[PDB]
Amino acid sequence: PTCNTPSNRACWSDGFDINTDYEVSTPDTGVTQSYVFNLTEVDNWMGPDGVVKEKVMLINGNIMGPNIVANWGDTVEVTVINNLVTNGTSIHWHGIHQKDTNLHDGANGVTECPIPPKGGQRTYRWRARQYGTSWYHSHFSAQYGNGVVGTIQINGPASLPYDIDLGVFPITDYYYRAADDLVHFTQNNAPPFSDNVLINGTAVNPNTGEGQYANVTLTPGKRHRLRILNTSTENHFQVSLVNHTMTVIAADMVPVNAMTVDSLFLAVGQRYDVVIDASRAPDNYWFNVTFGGQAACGGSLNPHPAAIFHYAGAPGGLPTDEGTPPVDHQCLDTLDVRPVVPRSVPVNSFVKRPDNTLPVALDLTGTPLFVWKVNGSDINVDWGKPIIDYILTGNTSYPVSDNIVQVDAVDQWTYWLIENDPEGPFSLPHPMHLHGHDFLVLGRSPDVPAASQQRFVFDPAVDLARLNGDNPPRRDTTMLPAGGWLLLAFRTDNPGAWLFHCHIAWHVSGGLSVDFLERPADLRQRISQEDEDDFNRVCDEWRAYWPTNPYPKIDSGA
Amino acid sequence: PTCNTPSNRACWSDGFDINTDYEVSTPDTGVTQSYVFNLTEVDNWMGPDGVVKEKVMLINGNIMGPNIVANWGDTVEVTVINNLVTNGTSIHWHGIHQKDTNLHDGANGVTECPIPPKGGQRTYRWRARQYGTSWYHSHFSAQYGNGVVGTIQINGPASLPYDIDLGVFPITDYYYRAADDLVHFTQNNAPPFSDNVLINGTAVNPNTGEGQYANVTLTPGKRHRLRILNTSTENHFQVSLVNHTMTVIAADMVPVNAMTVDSLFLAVGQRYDVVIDASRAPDNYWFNVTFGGQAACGGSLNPHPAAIFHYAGAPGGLPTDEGTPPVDHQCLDTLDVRPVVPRSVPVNSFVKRPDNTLPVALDLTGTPLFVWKVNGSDINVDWGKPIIDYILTGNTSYPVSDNIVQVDAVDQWTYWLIENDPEGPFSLPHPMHLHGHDFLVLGRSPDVPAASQQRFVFDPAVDLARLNGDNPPRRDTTMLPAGGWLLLAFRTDNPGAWLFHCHIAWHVSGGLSVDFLERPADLRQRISQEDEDDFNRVCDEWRAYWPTNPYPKIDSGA
């Protein structure tokens, strides 16, 4: 943080700027930012909107956990003490690649066993090889829907000059019913609408009027950086600010070229760092959270979830301009974003084959009704025996339920075609997410309305020309369009077991996931004795605790 | 028509005006309006938007049939000659009560056997006991989806003065794929969006630009009566005119007290007579067809279906003001409408009993996937042996599949609670329509977002107060809200077999229907020797034709 000034945000330190390939070069700071998480179960907790919730799971007694702040090249260490009654836990660091530190990913039944309750602990330590905005959450089923969530801000350079960094701005769905009850509900029923949408942890109740709108004070004439996150379990958001444009400087944790838009689509898990110029008249302006796609990717019972953007020195109160409804994004993220640091892949060479195809299908023949299958199999990870235990014991007999897609290719690009139930009854859009990598969104089926139920299968005769291998969007989460397909690509530079799943909590609970066992033969040697011992320590403590649990495992575990 | 002038539309003739009970008093004009319907099957037909359709079934070689225009009291006589290749037919007169003329209703497998093809004929004769706007269509499955539709205009008095009667304005969904192929698609798949939406038999293709917008010429300063109809197979419309208000003077074929609105919801089969005042600046204005209810009750591949309303003396071309999007009606018709001629019913005396409760359920366990059941049974009428045949032969052993809800009540109000799959995975909105009557809409479940998946079961403690029995909306079509309930009421004044079904073509084909066999004992004695002979004649000709038909019956028949 030497040469980083408001006028020159492109610079950071010697050898490190916005054009430096962050996936291969990282600043040697030697600084460690430590945090302690205390997961406690609170019954009959008073919510931000005046409504009392039956049960919540909280980190350090707050709605969200600590705002993790570190610099590019720092090491983030977190001790997670589980003081919940029955539930196990883990903390997944979404957007953190976890380069050669696979066992710190937090994916239950994959990279670790769940940390046992009644005082169980584990200390996560990872290097911040990427700068930007990210988030953390539990990976114990849909436990993060109870409140085990928070934000990660790794400071670094930018693709546009700005004066003030307003920090994190998480927008999430809010349900009065607990996550485990909602997983049981969605197994046999269609997903419900949210009761409210929280902006920076606050929202107003549409029935009573209680609570408060989020208040962001803008300094007149200054460029402000705002880090918008979607920490939701199901809801996909469309965000807009009345009489203002937002300039995207980053998509997820990948800095992109300046892209000025009127509105932004945020899928579950997606982040967007924007530059907002306080260029308009001194007044209060509404920041609106709308829903497009015709309820194909969510909705809220709060008809107008909003936040207030207040200009400093201007009068207070509620904004008078209700605004103009934004463009219907049709449950799709923009593929116009072009990364600052480029990547190139041959797209003409692609051929649709079974070992590169991941068909997402909805099975309505079994018990329960909503069972999501990827390649004819719904994922069901083993909390007692993770995929890493198999790696450490030289065991290759992975169960069909673990959905292991073994990628043996070394440091090469791998192409993946994900099909969204073309022959099925109906289709829903899916926020596809990959652990341990930022993928290249090469292409998707034609942008059509989400509830249209229009189908598209990959036809090389029209679609090979629709792909872009010259600096395509690089991110950790993107939309799988309803009724169609999606083409992705990631370079195998990080040996480990990585989940690739839909980020809608109900869908991943239903089974929408695969496990990319990347370079298994290379993985075993890269695991330190410290990580192995600790992996085995937590698994032993969990295997001892499980027979005393009064509740069963109703879902996938992921 | 004697005293019906632009300043006094309330008057009609001696003893007949807007306040007279049309349901029990009718003018004796002694005049008859005759029409001959020639149903031809046209392959590779050129559509209004430029697209060539595989097959269509048309009356007298046009997009719609002729506009049946008669006065109140006149008798409408129509000879339907069936020159189709394979299909049987009938023409149902929607909105027309058919007072003591049950055998002219056109409901196949209920009131008649289908008129055979290759020259089969039958003459329908019915008295114009009601005035206002209505429509007619085929009742041979979803055959009307191929183009066997048309409008009915029975002139009479109105509830507000106007100068010009612009006539009928039929708005319908338009599909490139034929009806029988769509019934087959919807049996196992979710209904698709319409390819386009025709307004008065015309539209512009959103991809090519071929075709024309509907052009209505408004005269400056004069009050214009517009008769808006929704003749769709699935699509439910929201209609609005840029910079103008619409003053509703009639809901279906029931005249209502003046009600000014900015927008109107029209369910499948709904009509609305509005008065548009040409009180704005001389220009071209857009008439917009929008979709609310977040695609719960339809949508279109044409993002903006519209018509042009040109003021006489103004310049030509397309309207420059795109306008502001209207309010989301959430797939619900307005219940604020109050009929001119009132009706009063006790709503406090209502008790939910199995013999007054009609549960709508979607069965997903059998083959095909989408099978709609009412009270545990999906309707399946017998084209070869109709309900009237059972009445004429003294046979009371009505099949389970005929869904006979026998109402013995003589000239008394009957209350029906229709439930919308409260315990099911998902629930869709249903435009409930009744034959031979105009029902009283006493109440429905609390108005909530259409695809919110909020459920409501009738709870006497909070719902009995929510009902209205003092001049409630009287019409033949209304919305059964998604996940809720609907309380209807009709006076048993017309003995006969009457269909009560969802008007979405695909849903009635799936089985969403019951048959109100009203006053059986009174019915046999009220059937004329001419109607009995015609019925048997058409049934003998159809039963003789059927074994030669190369296609089977894949749906309900309704």
Ligand SMILES: *[C@@H]1O[C@H](CO)[C@@H](O[C@@H]2O[C@H](CO)[C@@H](O[C@@H]3O[C@H](CO[C@H]4O[C@H](CO)[C@@H](O)[C@H](O)[C@@H]4O)[C@@H](O)[C@H](O)[C@@H]3O)[C@H](O)[C@H]2NC(C)=O)[C@H](O)[C@H]1NC(C)=O
């Ligand atoms: C009333 O007249 C209608 C007009 O002829 C009859 O509809 C026809 O019914 C037959 C039998 O159900 C259909 O044939 C079936 O079609 C489906 C789907 O094929 C269609 O789509 C594919 C793909 O786009 C295309 O390749 C075909 O050419 C078709 O367009 C097949 O899966 C079945 O095996 C079978 O071939 C006709 O398609 C349908 N025609 C139309 C224009 O609707 C109807 O049966 C008559 N009703 C009665 C009871 O007489």
Ligand SMILES: *[C@@H]1O[C@H](CO)[C@@H](O[C@@H]2O[C@H](CO)[C@@H](O[C@@H]3O[C@H](CO)[C@@H](O)[C@H](O)[C@@H]3O)[C@H](O)[C@H]2NC(C)=O)[C@H](O)[C@H]1NC(C)=O
């Ligand atoms: C993690 O801790 C949560 C919180 O206690 C556990 O959730 C609870 O799970 C039980 C059993 O699935 C739920 O009970 C069920 O309640 C419904 C009524 O809603 C009833 O019909 C069923 O028969 C059953 O008794 C309970 O509602 C639910 N609590 C909440 C607030 O979500 C969860 O089981 C724990 N997970 C594990 C595997 O330890």
Ligand SMILES: *[C@@H]1O[C@H](CO)[C@@H](O[C@@H]2O[C@H](CO)[C@@H](O[C@@H]3O[C@H](CO)[C@@H](O)[C@H](O)[C@@H]3O)[C@H](O)[C@H]2NC(C)=O)[C@H](O)[C@H]1NC(C)=O
């Ligand atoms: C959002 O937060 C901002 C603070 O960051 C609130 O703005 C503050 O609003 C008050 C009035 O509500 C302003 O004070 C007033 O100043 C006038 C002029 O001197 C005086 O006559 C009044 O008696 C009062 O003191 C205050 O200046 C302003 N703060 C800043 C830094 O501009 C705003 O009210 C909050 N919005 C909501 C809805 O809570």
Ligand SMILES: *[C@@H]1O[C@H](CO)[C@@H](O[C@@H]2O[C@H](CO)[C@@H](O[C@@H]3O[C@H](CO)[C@@H](O)[C@H](O)[C@@H]3O)[C@H](O)[C@H]2NC(C)=O)[C@H](O)[C@H]1NC(C)=O
């Ligand atoms: C952005 O969020 C704001 C605040 O949530 C939204 O403003 C709200 O807009 C609705 C109408 O769109 C207002 O309610 C309406 O009030 C009128 C009475 O004037 C009534 O006739 C309607 O039935 C409805 O109840 C609401 O009062 C207003 N909030 C405030 C405090 O002014 C705004 O609409 C959102 N902007 C967009 C484009 O989504």
Ligand SMILES: *[C@@H]1O[C@H](CO)[C@@H](O[C@@H]2O[C@H](CO)[C@@H](O[C@@H]3O[C@H](CO)[C@@H](O)[C@H](O)[C@@H]3O)[C@H](O)[C@H]2NC(C)=O)[C@H](O)[C@H]1NC(C)=O
């Ligand atoms: C009522 O119907 C009219 C006619 O269909 C609608 O006008 C149309 O509005 C759309 C979008 O609002 C216009 O398309 C847009 O064009 C611009 C470029 O000109 C493009 O950047 C957008 O992506 C979009 O394609 C369209 O030109 C316009 N039609 C014509 C011929 O003027 C109107 O929006 C409807 N009103 C409402 C409130 O529904």
Ligand SMILES: *[C@@H]1O[C@H](CO)[C@@H](O[C@@H]2O[C@H](CO)[C@@H](O)[C@H](O)[C@H]2NC(C)=O)[C@H](O)[C@H]1NC(C)=O
């Ligand atoms: C999806 O499942 C199918 C079936 O299990 C897999 O297809 C087989 O792939 C192997 C190569 O790994 C081929 O040798 C077989 O011929 C394929 N089966 C057939 C007959 O289609 C496919 O690999 C799986 N996809 C992934 C990547 O998980």
Ligand SMILES: *[C@@H]1O[C@H](CO)[C@@H](O[C@@H]2O[C@H](CO)[C@@H](O)[C@H](O)[C@H]2NC(C)=O)[C@H](O)[C@H]1NC(C)=O
């Ligand atoms: C609906 O479209 C029809 C055309 O099919 C219109 O009727 C024609 O109107 C023109 C101009 O008034 C006359 O010259 C023709 O003789 C009419 N033909 C018919 C069908 O009789 C009709 O006016 C349109 N309805 C509205 C109000 O827009």
Ligand SMILES: *[C@@H]1O[C@H](CO)[C@@H](O[C@@H]2O[C@H](CO)[C@@H](O)[C@H](O)[C@H]2NC(C)=O)[C@H](O)[C@H]1NC(C)=O
């Ligand atoms: C809608 O129809 C009217 C005719 O009633 C058209 O208006 C005429 O347009 C011409 C050429 O633009 C003018 O010279 C005349 O003065 C207009 N006559 C009238 C009736 O005032 C109008 O152009 C049509 N709109 C479209 C787009 O077809």
Ligand SMILES: *[C@@H]1O[C@H](CO)[C@@H](O[C@@H]2O[C@H](CO)[C@@H](O)[C@H](O)[C@H]2NC(C)=O)[C@H](O)[C@H]1NC(C)=O
């Ligand atoms: C719906 O089906 C149910 C069950 O077949 C019918 O309920 C029966 O109604 C008769 C007449 O009132 C009673 O004698 C039986 O005791 C009822 N059985 C039950 C379930 O309690 C009901 O009548 C049907 N509803 C309609 C209007 O068709």
Ligand SMILES: *[C@@H]1O[C@H](CO)[C@@H](O)[C@H](O)[C@H]1NC(C)=O
């Ligand atoms: C966690 O927080 C609870 C509630 O404040 C407290 O009682 C407990 O001692 C804490 N546990 C640890 C070890 O931090």
Ligand SMILES: *[C@@H]1O[C@H](CO)[C@@H](O)[C@H](O)[C@H]1NC(C)=O
């Ligand atoms: C978000 O809320 C926090 C309260 O913990 C506040 O300090 C911060 O400024 C808010 N962020 C903005 C500017 O929206």
Ligand SMILES: *[C@@H]1O[C@H](CO)[C@@H](O)[C@H](O)[C@H]1NC(C)=O
């Ligand atoms: C935005 O706000 C300014 C300040 O009040 C106002 O003058 C302007 O008209 C608004 N912009 C729009 C949408 O017209």
Ligand SMILES: *[C@@H]1O[C@H](CO)[C@@H](O)[C@H](O)[C@H]1NC(C)=O
């Ligand atoms: C691999 O794991 C399975 C599942 O626990 C076990 O039954 C089997 O014995 C193991 N095989 C090896 C090679 O250890």
Ligand SMILES: *[C@@H]1O[C@H](CO)[C@@H](O)[C@H](O)[C@H]1NC(C)=O
């Ligand atoms: C119906 O119209 C067709 C096509 O014009 C014609 O061939 C046929 O003779 C007509 N049938 C009758 C009896 O009108």
Ligand SMILES: *[C@@H]1O[C@H](CO)[C@@H](O)[C@H](O)[C@H]1NC(C)=O
């Ligand atoms: C009455 O109808 C049923 C059903 O079609 C039939 O089985 C029975 O024979 C009929 N009764 C007579 C004698 O007409």
Ligand SMILES: [Cl-]
């Ligand atoms: Cl009718």
